[PDB]
A paper describes a structure:
The structure was solved at 2.60-Å resolution in space group P21 by de novo phasing using selenomethionine. Continuous density could be traced for all amino acids, except those in two putative loops (Q65 to R78 in RT1 and G116 to D120 in RT2a). The thumb domain of [name] RT is similar to that of GII RT in being composed of three parallel α-helices (α1-3), but differs in extending straight up for 41 Å, 15 Å farther than in GII RT, and ending with additional short α-helices (α4 and α5) that interact with the thumb domain of the opposite monomer. RT2a is nearly identical to that in the GII RT cocrystal structure, but with a hinge region (G116 to D120) that connects to RT2 and is disordered in the absence of bound substrate. By contrast, RT3a in [name] RT differs markedly from that in group II intron RTs in forming a novel structural feature, a double-helical plug (denoted RT3a plug; highlighted in purple in Fig. 1 C and E). The RT3a plug is a structural adaptation that completely blocks the active site of [name] RT, rendering the apoenzyme inactive until it encounters a physiological substrate, as described further below. The structure of the RT3a plug and its binding in the active-site pocket of [name] RT are stabilized by an interaction network that includes salt bridges formed by two conserved arginine residues (R190 and R191) that are located within the 9-aa insertion and form part of the first α-helix of the RT3a plug.
Here, we determined a 2.6-Å crystal structure of a full-length [name] RT apoenzyme and a 2.8-Å cocrystal structure of [name] RT bound in an active conformation to a snapback DNA synthesis substrate and incoming dNTP. All RTs share a common structural framework composed of fingers, palm, and thumb or thumb surrogate regions that fold into a hand-like structure, forming a cleft containing an RT active site composed of three conserved aspartate residues that bind catalytic Mg2+ ions.
Author numbering:
A (entry chain B): 2 to 64, 81 to 117, 122 to 411
B (entry chain A): 1 to 64, 79 to 115, 121 to 411
The structure:
């Protein structure tokens, strides 16, 4: 079919590889950034192998993140469907569905609270990607595709990757992306579309009767004028989720899995603490960031003593390299939260960074005092020409 | 369309061509050359397809302060080289010439073997204005029977007219500022230049390697090795007669002391950026002087950035204390890796002492600047961004 030939064309496949590349570089993990580089090292034959297998309708190549051949096929399947299929173009353009962004949902949440949304319930659909009915998804997609090859490809994308997105795998994504939920949408490009197809009825039913429901994949936020309205909304949501064999964490019985109460006091949403007036990274996100920085400064502190005594020190953690990589870690994290207006927590984080940097600077000075020139070279991270020749 | 020209236009050979062009850009120290390759990489799908498409249409306008050839021109030249050397008998033959270079380290290795077997004297010269005085029609004349494909032949001619024939003495001096061994820059900036030189000087290579005279040539730099000063003088005059046959010449060391060398091999001589002596191979004095000047430039930029980042809040960050020590470290890595075939340890130690000394000056200047400074100045000076500046 024209639909399947569009997925097999190297134009859309190569076009999908760039999106997979960006989603990887937006992550802190070096292994994910280097995995894209090796696939890139075979760029001509590596994507033609995918194209050839799709033409033969052989999907065995799909077997914390999905493999790049799997990740590219998912991205290539999405772009074609959203510009060729009316339903896919429709569910991805849902006003209350975000993912195909976090800043938009939080901006909409903030706007609602500024305009009467004084109470909220924020919950999650537990075990969403494992409890969703694979056969209902294919059922809802079959007439809109009219291509059993594309349907089987979508079916194999779910079986190999999407249905395996469990809570253990999601926790691995949180330590990789600054806003953890953005990892699912980018390690599995079909997950936003998969959730939008399965919860399209849920979205339509929940945005009514003065209740706003903002949803990002399987995380949703109910906003209302009174506590009674959001309480009625949550029970209405449990029934809608129950129609398709799903549930949601009750904030009244699972205090740590869901939130409930006034919006004026603030609540966590998509990795940020959202008040009607203040938007900042959540306490859990900042704790994760301070722990990431501590590990780099600890590694830099050990390398000061190692490079002063030994000549096989890894330059990656030398003084120049460590300060260089910590700078990039700060750049990547701050850029992910440029939509936030909380200046106090950023300055508090800056004081934490400057404090540990002062500890490292003072430690370097004490070690390099009365040291010889070659020791200063290994500690600061500037190679000796004689070592390269030896 | 012939199978030879379809091979050049295939994206597979165009991809292996650009991967080498990308690699050669990183082997250069110039940040502009490394970032120019990234801009062509920013359009990776359509950038190489535009070339593939225009080649199939035989439209070569895309080949048109720039020291290297443009990346589309550089890619096509590399693709033309890869296809020719594995398909044409002459091209694989002239590239596999024993006395033609097989990197610089092999030419220097062959020079040591000649000295090891009796070459007590030498003459090292250059063919001046080689690429501008090269005859376009003689090149096509030597290639036309071995190709049998006018499409590939006209593409070779347009590569010469747009890039190779414009490699003049002013542009070569720009290549020395970029690569540790300056003559390697010609091969990296214009991939077809070694093949073009080997095709043009094939008769010269055959005539010179005779009568007990070893002739080692790298593009347009050549070295004559013989048992006596009389032998290499006879050989140099034989080289002038051969170069005069094709409207070329070579610098006479007897009249141009600074353009060519002549004398005993035991006292040492400069060849391909290296000083070659009986047992000591090391970077030449000009190569070491050019390297110290590059390090001086980075430390000057690092020194000025300490003063700038301490006074102003729009610092580049590229030359901050951590970033400067980082790039200088890599500059030292790239320069040292290029002379791993050398065995002269005293000059590597002398350069290390030079590096350690400039590093001590910079560390002392940073200490005086950061003394009695606040935390925000130390952040800009050391090269650790502020989270509050990103959010603003």
């Amino acid at each position: 079919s024209r639909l399947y030939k569009d997925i097999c064309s190297l134009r859309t496949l190569y076009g999908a590889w760039r999106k997979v590349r960006s989603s990887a570089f937006l992550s802190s993990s070096d292994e994910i950034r280097r995995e894209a580089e090796e696939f890139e090292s075979r760029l001509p034959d590596s994507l033609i192998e995918i194209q050839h297998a799709l033409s033969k309708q052989i999907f065995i190549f799909l077997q914390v993140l999905a493999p790049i051949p799997n990740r590219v096929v998912q991205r290539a399947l999405l772009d074609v469907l959203q510009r060729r299929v009316r339903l896919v173009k429709r569910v991805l353009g849902t006003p209350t569905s975000y993912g195909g962004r976090v800043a938009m949902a939080i901006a909409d949440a903030r706007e609602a609270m500024r305009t009467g949304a004084r109470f909220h319930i924020r919950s999650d659909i537990p075990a969403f990607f494992t409890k969703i009915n694979k056969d209902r998804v294919l059922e809802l997609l079959r007439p809109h595709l009219n291509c059993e090859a594309t349907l089987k490809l979508f079916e194999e994308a779910i079986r190999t990757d999407l249905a395996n997105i469990d809570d253990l795998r999601r926790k691995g994504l949180d330590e990789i992306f600054p806003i953890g939920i953005e990892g699912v949408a980018q390690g599995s490009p079909l997950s936003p579309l998969l959730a939008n197809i399965y919860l399209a009825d849920f979205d339509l039913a929940m945005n009514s009767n003065g209740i706003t429901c903002l949803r990002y994949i399987d995380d949703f936020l109910l906003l209302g004028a009174s506590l009674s309205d959001v309480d009625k909304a949550f029970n209405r949501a449990l029934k809608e989720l129950g129609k398709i064999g799903l549930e949601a964490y009750d904030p009244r019985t699972d205090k740590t899995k869901a939130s409930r109460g006034a919006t004026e006091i603030g609540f966590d949403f998509l990795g940020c603490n959202v008040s009607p007036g203040l938007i900042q990274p959540s306490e859990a996100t900042r704790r994760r960031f301070r722990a990431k920085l501590d590990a780099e400064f600890v590694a830099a502190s050990h390398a000061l003593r190692y490079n002063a005594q030994y000549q096989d020190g890894d330059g990656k953690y030398s003084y120049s390299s460590a300060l260089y990589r910590i700078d990039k870690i700060i750049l990547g994290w701050g850029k992910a939260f440029t939509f936030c207006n909380g200046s106090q927590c950023m300055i508090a984080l800056d004081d934490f960074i400057s404090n540990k940097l002062a500890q490292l600077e003072a430690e370097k000075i004490a070690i390099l005092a009365n040291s010889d020139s070659t020791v200063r070279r290994r500690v600061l991270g500037v190679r000796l020409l004689i070592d390269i020749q030896n």
